[PDB]
């Protein structure tokens, strides 16, 4: 009836697409042989958004998982949850890009897109009324950062009305994984603004500054960090899959979060985060899911909006109460921190209510915040891309792959101005 | 032969059409299977040669996960399979989605099913329409239904009972543009038009009843307690009767002014009403005090210019007329000069029916006043003030233009409101 | 104590339409004391014209 | 004997892997299944009866993880005898199961 | 001096990250096991 056909890309894309499909599989009660051994029958109503159907009671996802070397899908085929994906749906190359945009944008990427563009038309066409797609990649690789931006630019041309979201991984600003990772990031962003409907922003020290300080952990794996960005990732498509008093979906949030199609840069969060030894010592009530969101610690971007303005602010609630006592906090927060919203909107906080809680939990909430706190995020790429390009550093990796220096020059002017477009509303 | 075919549109349509059609199953003698375990059901239910009583209702939504639940749960075999209309995608807080593109393939299946019920009714009094300005189907498709309702039936009675947005809180952002541009269509295409605001039932349910922390269901029950008193005289006997034609006759002096209010008097809990006298004076005092209304705007700035009263149960015409003669005289309340008498009364024998799981007690008297006033000129003032605060930056308008729509509706729907904002003090003076 | 200790709570997985709208008892149905009796058929234009 | 899919609040004591505990209730998160360690012969051993004192892997049926013994972190108890239990399947660089996961059901 | 400001901000960013991780959370786990 409505479906979501799912796109992944790389090592970021497969070590996140291995855990997102673990939380969804626990949500609808899916064991790693496919079948269903859940309790109720709210756990089988809207399962067709994510899972297909096959022989018997088998439910295999709508997943497109792509890389340019199969040393990443050798692991995800051989995890606990590796027999749940259909074997045709991995797409792998032979020689990857490896931290270069152009190699996986023209040379190796553009010869590999002609089989990924067959696995999506075989599978978007199976769906009855597809809502849209999701992507989750990183802007710091060469697999998802180059070719994943080339499937964004070449799936919006066949299906130009269906939805396009991105759980992107923008650079960590403080301690970084790769030297030349600015070049891969800043050329994707200009390729990202014209062909994406709405964009989240998922940083990795934005996850480190939670799990250090909020969950009190001293062994935080990525297998811990991928829960924190799949708790939200299924916390946006809740009301498609579960009923409520007031519903939403991926279409209705971007309606209230994209004032103009150059403006879809969010920063997400998540309410019920406490330690395991600080677990029983707090009552899980309504104001204690909204005292945490507006705080400057919960967000999944590494950017603080006290300098900026919350342009618009979303919310999606779970648990069998969001009706009157959420409406005296969303009325309270619009009045107390009165200088963090801009004047030219009536009111900013949007609301949905799903009534079914996450499993093992009583209540929750999830944030989608369109801000003028992303124009301080794209300036720390272009204060390090101009601390690199005046000395023409690493450039021989790019001009010999068929690019040219004006294409490097153009991604300066079309991201310096998008900060100068955001900068007025402060 | 006294039929009242209901129209409910949306997620305010079906969460209200669940509560309204739950009261009538216990107001008359209806099992939730549809059977019975002395003919008042002929307004709402229809017969068969097996004793089954199928309602004369339509439930319209563009989202399947609101109406695929009513066909799943308890009141399942009561409703016909085809009386509940569902889309495949939702219009998603928009106008043109609801009005032009998506609303054009659900405008046709409904008008086959309105025509099938209306051919069954001989003496059909008129349609009732309940919807919400805050959504896509409730505000885009609903004004499209009434643009294609007037050609099929003309002067047939079509009443409005809309969920206007609240002046302090609201659930959304772009929701004024649906709320503004519905009124350009629902002025020529609405006979009478009630209003409610959910924050003005939030504070009532926690103050005037002890039940705090409600849901919309504890707000849906009081909305369904207005509608029983509207169709009160059509099914049960009365000392004086009202009818569907009577409300717009004595509350709509001018055809651009069809905006009453709604207020329900004895809102007191199952315990707090059990320990206090509730005379006819002591319920007509509640409907005039400005802390009991179903809107968040005080008529102390305004002038009452037509009225209507409904009564239930243990009422005597002497004590009705003893407390009317007080509230004429008090100067907390004033009228406009050009309405000389300013009332209409209607008395129904049958006392109202308690809902199991509700929050009201067994009572004997009740009042459903519908007093239109000049204090709705401070309602369109706030829905304008935040519309030209946000149309100055073109803040959302690109969602609407590329959806089978043109730009020029916005620059006339505000200039339509400017005339109707100037209408309400010429009549008000 | 009834607020502290829980109900057995197999209602964690519950849509409000199931909890807030159950089947009411068979005896809470309204008796229609004041209703025009239907044993004598009502005045209706049985001339079909 | 029970163990649930891992969440962000339900982790083991010293290691923070999938935890295993005891509960009164009945569910499908209580059913285990035991297989052979030599990985090229388990599809030939899918229906054979299990001998008593032989080294066989134990795994869950809902998570497909497996019960483990951590000989590396200690739990001081009243009885003084120490180890940790959890459920996480371990494999080597040759991709066979480590000696951590072998279990024996002796009579 | 401009590069002094840039270097000072860079070192306090990375150094605040490393302090807030190790020397303020390893003591937390040691404190809790010591108290148990
Ligand atoms: N009092 C009351 N208000 C309601 C009820 N249901 C919804 N509302 C209000 O109605 C508005 C809901 O918008 P929707 O009805 O969901 O919009 P829609 O008709 O479903 O169409 P969409 O745009 O597709 O969502 C909100 O302002 C709610 O506060 C109800 O049952 N009772
Ligand atoms: N949050 C998160 N970050 C990851 C994960 N896997 C890799 N990364 C980050 O991704 C960056 C390297 O990704 P890379 O291997 O270049 O991605 P790819 O080449 O496109 O597949 C590093 O900064 C990692 O910190 C993951 O599972 N979760
Ligand atoms: Mg709907």
Coordinates of N, CA, C and O in Angstrom, one line a residue, chain B residues 264-409:
Chain B
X264 N -22.2 23.8 26.2 CA -23.0 22.8 26.9 C -22.9 23.0 28.4 O -21.9 23.1 29.0
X265 N -24.1 23.1 29.0 CA -24.2 23.6 30.3 C -23.7 22.7 31.4 O -22.7 22.9 32.0
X266 N -24.4 21.5 31.7 CA -24.0 20.8 32.9 C -22.8 19.9 32.7 O -22.9 18.7 32.7
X267 N -21.6 20.6 32.7 CA -20.4 19.8 32.6 C -19.8 19.7 34.0 O -19.0 20.6 34.5
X268 N -20.3 18.7 34.8 CA -19.9 18.5 36.2 C -19.7 17.0 36.3 O -20.4 16.3 35.7
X269 N -18.7 16.6 37.1 CA -18.3 15.2 37.1 C -19.3 14.2 37.6 O -20.4 14.6 38.1
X270 N -19.0 13.0 37.6 CA -19.9 11.9 38.1 C -20.1 12.0 39.6 O -21.0 11.4 40.1
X271 N -19.2 12.6 40.3 CA -19.3 12.8 41.8 C -19.7 14.3 42.1 O -20.6 14.4 43.0
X272 N -19.1 15.3 41.5 CA -19.4 16.6 41.9 C -20.8 17.1 41.5 O -21.3 18.1 42.0
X273 N -21.4 16.5 40.5 CA -22.8 16.8 40.2 C -23.8 16.0 41.1 O -25.0 16.3 41.1
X274 N -23.3 15.0 41.8 CA -24.1 14.1 42.6 C -24.3 14.7 44.0 O -25.1 14.2 44.8
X275 N -23.7 15.9 44.3 CA -23.8 16.5 45.6 C -24.1 18.0 45.5 O -23.7 18.8 46.3
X276 N -24.9 18.4 44.5 CA -25.3 19.8 44.3 C -26.6 19.8 43.4 O -26.7 19.0 42.5
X277 N -27.4 20.8 43.8 CA -28.7 21.0 43.0 C -28.3 21.5 41.6 O -27.4 22.3 41.5
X278 N -29.1 21.2 40.6 CA -28.8 21.5 39.2 C -30.1 22.0 38.6 O -30.5 21.5 37.5
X279 N -30.7 23.1 39.1 CA -31.9 23.6 38.6 C -31.7 24.3 37.3 O -30.5 24.5 36.8
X280 N -32.8 24.6 36.6 CA -32.7 25.2 35.2 C -32.1 26.6 35.3 O -31.4 27.0 34.3
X281 N -32.2 27.3 36.4 CA -31.4 28.5 36.6 C -29.9 28.1 36.7 O -29.1 28.8 36.1
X282 N -29.6 27.1 37.4 CA -28.2 26.7 37.6 C -27.5 26.0 36.5 O -26.4 25.6 36.6
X283 N -28.2 25.8 35.3 CA -27.5 25.4 34.1 C -27.5 26.6 33.1 O -26.5 26.7 32.3
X284 N -28.4 27.5 33.1 CA -28.4 28.6 32.2 C -27.4 29.7 32.7 O -27.1 30.6 31.9
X285 N -27.0 29.6 34.0 CA -25.9 30.5 34.4 C -24.6 30.1 33.9 O -23.7 30.9 33.7
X286 N -24.4 28.8 33.6 CA -23.1 28.3 33.2 C -22.8 28.7 31.7 O -21.7 29.0 31.4
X287 N -23.8 28.7 30.9 CA -23.7 28.9 29.4 C -23.4 30.4 29.1 O -23.2 30.7 28.0
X288 N -23.5 31.3 30.1 CA -23.3 32.7 29.9 C -22.0 33.2 30.6 O -21.5 34.2 30.2
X289 N -21.5 32.4 31.6 CA -20.2 32.8 32.2 C -19.1 32.5 31.2 O -19.1 31.5 30.6
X290 N -18.1 33.4 31.1 CA -17.1 33.3 30.0 C -16.0 32.3 30.2 O -15.0 32.3 29.5
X291 N -16.1 31.4 31.2 CA -15.2 30.4 31.4 C -15.7 29.0 31.1 O -15.1 28.0 31.5
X292 N -16.8 28.9 30.3 CA -17.4 27.6 30.1 C -17.6 27.3 28.6 O -18.2 26.3 28.2
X293 N -17.2 28.2 27.7 CA -17.5 28.1 26.3 C -16.6 27.1 25.6 O -15.6 26.7 26.1
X294 N -17.1 26.7 24.4 CA -16.3 25.9 23.5 C -15.6 26.7 22.4 O -15.5 26.2 21.3
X295 N -15.0 27.8 22.8 CA -14.1 28.6 22.0 C -13.3 29.4 23.0 O -13.6 29.5 24.1
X296 N -12.1 29.8 22.5 CA -11.3 30.7 23.4 C -11.4 32.2 22.9 O -10.4 32.8 22.4
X297 N -12.6 32.7 23.0 CA -12.8 34.2 22.9 C -14.0 34.6 23.7 O -15.1 34.1 23.5
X298 N -13.8 35.6 24.5 CA -14.8 36.2 25.4 C -15.8 37.1 24.6 O -15.3 38.0 23.9
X299 N -17.1 36.9 24.7 CA -18.1 37.8 24.2 C -18.2 39.1 25.0 O -19.2 39.9 24.6
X300 N -17.4 39.4 26.0 CA -17.5 40.7 26.7 C -17.1 41.9 25.8 O -17.5 43.0 25.9
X301 N -16.2 41.6 24.8 CA -15.9 42.5 23.7 C -17.0 42.6 22.7 O -17.1 43.5 21.9
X302 N -17.9 41.5 22.7 CA -18.8 41.3 21.6 C -20.3 41.5 22.0 O -20.6 41.9 23.2
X303 N -21.1 41.4 21.0 CA -22.6 41.6 21.2 C -23.3 40.3 20.7 O -23.1 39.9 19.6
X304 N -24.1 39.7 21.6 CA -25.0 38.6 21.2 C -26.1 39.2 20.3 O -26.8 40.1 20.6
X305 N -26.2 38.5 19.1 CA -27.2 39.1 18.1 C -28.2 38.0 17.6 O -29.1 38.4 16.9
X306 N -28.1 36.8 18.0 CA -29.1 35.8 17.9 C -28.8 34.7 18.9 O -27.6 34.5 19.3
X307 N -29.8 33.9 19.3 CA -29.6 32.9 20.2 C -30.5 31.7 19.9 O -31.3 31.7 19.0
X308 N -30.3 30.6 20.6 CA -31.1 29.4 20.5 C -30.8 28.6 21.8 O -29.7 28.5 22.3
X309 N -31.9 28.0 22.3 CA -31.7 27.1 23.5 C -32.4 25.8 23.2 O -33.4 25.7 22.6
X310 N -31.7 24.7 23.8 CA -32.3 23.4 23.8 C -32.3 22.9 25.2 O -31.6 23.3 26.1
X311 N -33.3 22.0 25.5 CA -33.6 21.6 26.8 C -33.9 20.1 26.8 O -34.4 19.5 25.9
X312 N -33.5 19.4 27.9 CA -33.7 18.0 28.1 C -34.3 17.7 29.4 O -34.0 18.3 30.4
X313 N -35.2 16.7 29.5 CA -35.4 15.9 30.7 C -36.5 16.5 31.6 O -37.7 16.4 31.3
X314 N -36.0 17.0 32.7 CA -36.9 17.4 33.8 C -37.1 18.9 33.8 O -36.9 19.6 34.7
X315 N -37.6 19.4 32.6 CA -37.8 20.9 32.5 C -39.2 21.2 32.5 O -40.1 20.4 32.0
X316 N -39.6 22.3 33.2 CA -40.9 22.9 33.3 C -40.8 24.2 32.6 O -39.8 24.9 32.7
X317 N -41.8 24.6 31.8 CA -41.8 25.9 31.1 C -41.8 27.1 32.1 O -41.4 28.2 31.7
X318 N -42.2 26.9 33.3 CA -42.2 28.0 34.3 C -40.8 28.4 34.7 O -40.5 29.6 34.7
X319 N -40.0 27.5 35.1 CA -38.7 27.8 35.5 C -37.7 28.1 34.4 O -36.6 28.7 34.7
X320 N -38.0 27.6 33.2 CA -37.3 28.1 32.0 C -37.4 29.7 31.9 O -36.5 30.4 31.9
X321 N -38.7 30.1 32.0 CA -39.0 31.5 31.8 C -38.7 32.4 33.0 O -38.7 33.6 32.9
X322 N -38.4 31.8 34.2 CA -38.0 32.6 35.3 C -36.5 33.0 35.3 O -36.2 34.1 35.8
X323 N -35.7 32.1 34.8 CA -34.2 32.5 34.7 C -33.8 33.2 33.4 O -32.8 33.8 33.3
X324 N -34.7 33.1 32.3 CA -34.5 33.9 31.2 C -34.6 35.3 31.5 O -33.8 36.2 31.2
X325 N -35.6 35.7 32.4 CA -35.9 37.0 32.7 C -34.9 37.7 33.6 O -34.9 38.9 33.8
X326 N -33.9 36.9 34.2 CA -32.8 37.5 34.9 C -31.7 37.9 33.9 O -31.3 39.1 33.9
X327 N -31.2 37.0 33.1 CA -30.1 37.2 32.2 C -30.4 38.2 31.1 O -29.5 38.6 30.4
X328 N -31.7 38.5 30.9 CA -32.0 39.7 30.1 C -31.5 40.9 30.7 O -31.0 41.9 30.0
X329 N -31.5 41.0 32.0 CA -31.4 42.3 32.7 C -29.9 42.6 33.2 O -29.6 43.7 33.3
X330 N -29.1 41.5 33.3 CA -27.7 41.8 33.8 C -26.9 42.4 32.7 O -27.0 42.1 31.5
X331 N -26.0 43.3 33.1 CA -25.2 44.1 32.2 C -23.8 43.6 32.0 O -23.0 44.3 31.5
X332 N -23.5 42.4 32.5 CA -22.4 41.7 32.0 C -22.7 41.2 30.6 O -21.7 41.0 29.8
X333 N -23.9 41.0 30.2 CA -24.4 40.6 28.9 C -25.1 41.7 28.3 O -26.0 42.4 28.9
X334 N -24.8 42.0 27.0 CA -25.5 43.0 26.3 C -25.8 42.5 24.9 O -25.1 41.6 24.4
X335 N -26.9 43.0 24.3 CA -27.2 42.6 22.9 C -27.0 43.8 22.0 O -26.7 44.9 22.4
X336 N -27.0 43.5 20.7 CA -27.1 44.5 19.7 C -28.6 45.1 19.7 O -29.5 44.4 20.2
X337 N -28.7 46.3 19.3 CA -30.0 47.0 19.4 C -31.1 46.4 18.4 O -32.3 46.4 18.7
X338 N -30.6 45.9 17.2 CA -31.5 45.5 16.2 C -32.1 44.1 16.3 O -32.9 43.7 15.5
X339 N -31.7 43.4 17.3 CA -32.4 42.1 17.6 C -33.3 42.3 18.8 O -32.8 42.4 19.9
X340 N -34.6 42.5 18.7 CA -35.4 43.0 19.8 C -35.7 42.0 20.9 O -35.7 42.3 22.1
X341 N -35.9 40.7 20.5 CA -36.2 39.6 21.4 C -35.1 38.6 21.7 O -34.7 38.4 22.8
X342 N -34.6 38.1 20.6 CA -33.3 37.4 20.6 C -33.2 36.0 21.3 O -32.2 35.7 21.9
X343 N -34.2 35.2 21.1 CA -34.2 33.9 21.6 C -35.0 32.9 20.8 O -35.7 33.2 19.9
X344 N -34.8 31.6 21.1 CA -35.6 30.5 20.5 C -35.4 29.3 21.5 O -34.3 29.0 21.8
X345 N -36.5 28.8 21.9 CA -36.4 27.7 22.9 C -37.0 26.4 22.3 O -37.9 26.5 21.3
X346 N -36.6 25.3 22.8 CA -37.0 24.0 22.3 C -36.8 23.0 23.3 O -35.7 22.8 23.9
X347 N -37.9 22.2 23.6 CA -37.9 21.4 24.8 C -38.1 19.9 24.4 O -39.0 19.6 23.6
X348 N -37.2 19.1 24.8 CA -37.2 17.6 24.5 C -37.5 16.9 25.8 O -36.8 17.1 26.8
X349 N -38.4 15.9 25.8 CA -38.8 15.2 27.0 C -37.7 14.3 27.4 O -37.4 14.2 28.6
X350 N -37.0 13.6 26.5 CA -36.0 12.5 26.8 C -34.8 13.1 27.5 O -34.1 14.0 26.9
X351 N -34.4 12.6 28.7 CA -33.1 13.0 29.3 C -32.0 12.3 28.6 O -32.1 11.3 28.0
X352 N -30.8 13.0 28.6 CA -29.6 12.4 27.9 C -29.1 11.1 28.5 O -29.2 10.9 29.7
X353 N -28.5 10.3 27.6 CA -28.1 8.9 27.9 C -26.6 8.9 28.4 O -25.7 9.5 27.7
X354 N -26.3 8.3 29.5 CA -25.0 8.2 30.0 C -24.1 7.2 29.2 O -24.6 6.1 28.8
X355 N -22.9 7.6 28.8 CA -22.0 6.7 28.1 C -21.1 6.0 29.1 O -20.5 6.6 30.0
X356 N -21.0 4.6 29.0 CA -20.1 3.9 29.9 C -18.7 4.1 29.5 O -18.3 3.7 28.4
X357 N -17.9 4.6 30.5 CA -16.6 5.0 30.2 C -16.4 6.5 30.0 O -15.3 6.9 29.7
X358 N -17.4 7.3 30.1 CA -17.4 8.7 29.9 C -17.0 9.4 31.2 O -16.3 8.8 32.1
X359 N -17.4 10.7 31.3 CA -17.0 11.4 32.5 C -18.1 12.4 33.0 O -17.9 13.4 33.6
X360 N -19.4 12.0 32.6 CA -20.5 12.8 33.0 C -21.5 11.8 33.7 O -21.5 10.6 33.5
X361 N -22.4 12.4 34.6 CA -23.3 11.6 35.4 C -24.7 11.6 34.8 O -25.0 12.2 33.8
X362 N -25.6 10.8 35.4 CA -27.0 10.8 35.2 C -27.5 12.2 35.6 O -27.6 12.5 36.7
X363 N -28.0 12.9 34.6 CA -28.5 14.3 34.9 C -29.9 14.4 34.4 O -30.5 13.4 33.8
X364 N -30.6 15.5 34.7 CA -32.0 15.7 34.4 C -32.2 16.9 33.5 O -33.3 17.1 32.9
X365 N -31.3 17.9 33.4 CA -31.4 19.1 32.7 C -30.2 19.4 31.9 O -29.1 19.0 32.4
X366 N -30.3 20.1 30.8 CA -29.1 20.4 29.9 C -29.5 21.5 29.0 O -30.7 21.8 28.7
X367 N -28.5 22.3 28.5 CA -28.6 23.4 27.6 C -27.5 23.3 26.6 O -26.4 23.2 26.9
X368 N -27.9 23.5 25.3 CA -27.0 23.6 24.2 C -27.2 24.9 23.5 O -27.9 25.0 22.5
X369 N -26.7 26.0 24.0 CA -26.8 27.3 23.4 C -25.9 27.4 22.2 O -24.8 26.9 22.2
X370 N -26.4 28.2 21.2 CA -25.7 28.5 20.0 C -25.8 30.0 19.7 O -26.7 30.4 19.0
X371 N -25.0 30.7 20.4 CA -25.1 32.2 20.4 C -24.0 32.8 19.5 O -22.9 32.9 19.9
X372 N -24.4 33.2 18.3 CA -23.5 33.9 17.4 C -23.3 35.3 17.9 O -24.2 35.9 18.5
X373 N -22.1 35.9 17.7 CA -21.7 37.2 18.3 C -20.7 37.9 17.4 O -20.4 37.4 16.3
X374 N -20.3 39.0 17.9 CA -19.3 39.8 17.3 C -17.9 39.5 17.7 O -16.9 39.9 17.1
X375 N -17.8 38.6 18.8 CA -16.5 38.2 19.3 C -15.8 37.1 18.5 O -15.0 36.3 19.0
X376 N -16.3 36.9 17.2 CA -15.5 36.1 16.2 C -14.7 37.0 15.3 O -13.9 36.5 14.5
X377 N -14.9 38.3 15.4 CA -14.0 39.2 14.7 C -12.6 39.3 15.4 O -11.7 39.9 14.9
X378 N -12.5 38.7 16.6 CA -11.2 38.5 17.2 C -10.7 37.1 17.0 O -9.7 36.6 17.7
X379 N -11.3 36.3 16.1 CA -10.8 35.0 15.7 C -10.2 35.0 14.3 O -9.2 34.5 14.1
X380 N -10.9 35.7 13.3 CA -10.3 36.0 12.0 C -9.2 37.0 12.1 O -8.4 37.1 11.2
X381 N -9.1 37.8 13.2 CA -8.0 38.7 13.4 C -6.7 38.0 13.7 O -5.7 38.4 13.1
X382 N -6.8 37.0 14.5 CA -5.6 36.2 14.8 C -5.2 35.3 13.7 O -4.0 35.0 13.6
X383 N -6.1 34.7 13.0 CA -5.8 33.9 11.8 C -5.3 34.7 10.6 O -4.7 34.2 9.7
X384 N -5.6 36.0 10.6 CA -4.9 36.9 9.7 C -3.6 37.4 10.1 O -2.6 37.4 9.3
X385 N -3.5 37.8 11.4 CA -2.3 38.4 11.9 C -1.1 37.5 11.8 O 0.0 38.0 11.5
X386 N -1.3 36.2 11.9 CA -0.2 35.2 11.7 C -0.2 34.7 10.2 O 0.6 33.8 9.9
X387 N -1.0 35.3 9.3 CA -1.0 34.9 7.9 C -0.2 35.9 7.1 O 0.5 35.6 6.2
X388 N -0.4 37.2 7.4 CA 0.4 38.2 6.7 C 1.7 38.5 7.5 O 2.5 39.3 7.1
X389 N 1.9 37.8 8.7 CA 3.2 37.8 9.3 C 4.1 36.8 8.5 O 5.3 36.9 8.6
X390 N 3.5 35.9 7.8 CA 4.3 34.8 7.2 C 4.1 34.7 5.7 O 5.0 34.1 5.0
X391 N 3.1 35.4 5.1 CA 3.1 35.5 3.7 C 4.0 36.6 3.2 O 4.3 36.7 2.0
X392 N 4.6 37.4 4.1 CA 5.5 38.5 3.6 C 6.8 37.9 3.2 O 7.5 38.6 2.4
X393 N 7.2 36.7 3.7 CA 8.5 36.1 3.3 C 8.3 34.9 2.4 O 9.2 34.2 2.1
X394 N 7.0 34.7 1.8 CA 6.7 33.6 1.0 C 7.0 32.3 1.5 O 7.5 31.4 0.8
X395 N 6.8 32.1 2.9 CA 7.5 31.1 3.7 C 7.2 29.7 3.4 O 8.0 28.8 3.7
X396 N 6.1 29.4 2.7 CA 5.8 28.0 2.4 C 5.2 27.8 1.0 O 4.9 26.7 0.7
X397 N 5.0 28.9 0.2 CA 4.1 28.9 -0.9 C 4.4 28.0 -2.0 O 3.5 27.6 -2.8
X398 N 5.7 27.5 -2.1 CA 6.1 26.7 -3.2 C 5.5 25.3 -3.1 O 5.6 24.5 -4.0
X399 N 5.1 24.9 -1.9 CA 4.4 23.6 -1.7 C 3.1 23.6 -2.5 O 2.7 22.5 -3.1
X400 N 2.4 24.7 -2.6 CA 1.1 24.8 -3.1 C 1.0 25.0 -4.6 O 0.1 24.5 -5.2
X401 N 2.0 25.7 -5.2 CA 1.9 26.1 -6.6 C 2.0 25.0 -7.5 O 1.2 24.8 -8.4
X402 N 3.0 24.1 -7.3 CA 3.2 23.0 -8.2 C 2.4 21.8 -7.9 O 2.9 20.7 -8.0
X403 N 1.1 22.0 -7.6 CA 0.2 20.9 -7.2 C -1.1 21.0 -7.9 O -2.2 20.9 -7.2
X404 N -1.1 21.3 -9.2 CA -2.4 21.6 -9.9 C -3.1 22.8 -9.5 O -4.3 22.9 -9.5
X405 N -2.3 23.9 -9.1 CA -2.8 25.1 -8.5 C -2.1 26.2 -9.1 O -1.0 26.1 -9.7
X406 N -2.7 27.4 -9.0 CA -2.0 28.7 -9.4 C -1.8 29.5 -8.1 O -2.3 29.2 -7.0
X407 N -1.0 30.6 -8.2 CA -0.6 31.4 -7.1 C -1.7 32.3 -6.6 O -1.8 32.6 -5.4
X408 N -2.6 32.8 -7.5 CA -3.5 33.9 -7.2 C -4.6 33.6 -6.2 O -5.3 34.6 -5.8
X409 N -4.8 32.4 -5.7 CA -5.7 32.1 -4.7 C -5.3 32.8 -3.3 O -6.2 33.2 -2.6

